[PDB]
Design a protein around this ligand. Structure first.
Ligand SMILES: CN1CCc2c(cccc2Nc2cnn(C)c(=O)c2Cl)C1
Ligand SMILES: CN1CCc2c(cccc2Nc2cnn(C)c(=O)c2Cl)C1
Length: 101
């Protein structure tokens, strides 16, 4: 594991601690979220992010942060402002970015 891989594994562990229900742990299915794949062009989740780290698909912290933001943006797009996923996505976006400086 390269230095970037190690740093990103650290960040991912800390980010996932902010999602204790694991709402962002795995891809959203259309079964749980009707029409999701039609509304969200580029899905993302922490599990996919983990696989990308292990496959050495991130070459910068900027790339990793963009996937994190994509995941949060997707939750803020499909879900309405009032809602649990929207609020958590917005919360962890800000805290996570701060955490990753
Ligand atoms: C395997 N996981 C997939 C994701 C998930 C599960 C359970 C409860 C909430 C979620 N996460 C959702 C679900 N629906 N929507 C619309 C979302 O935006 C998220 Cl993050 C089961
Ligand atoms: C004193 N701080 C320095 C920063 C830091 C610490 C611990 C865990 C992650 C970080 N943050 C990093 C580390 N390395 N790189 C390359 C970064 O870009 C960031 Cl934000 C301890």
């Amino acid at each position: 594991s390269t230095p970037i891989q190690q740093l990103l594994e650290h960040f991912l562990r800390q980010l996932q601690r902010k999602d204790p229900h694991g709402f962002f742990a795995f891809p959203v299915t259309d079964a749980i979220a009707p029409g999701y794949s039609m509304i969200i062009k580029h899905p993302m989740d922490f599990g996919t992010m983990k696989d990308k780290i292990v496959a050495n698909e991130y070459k910068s912290v900027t790339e990793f942060k963009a996937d994190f933001k994509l995941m949060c943006d997707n939750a803020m797009t499909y879900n309405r402002p009032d809602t649990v996923y929207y609020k958590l996505a917005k919360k962890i976006l800000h805290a996570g970015f701060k955490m990753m400086s």
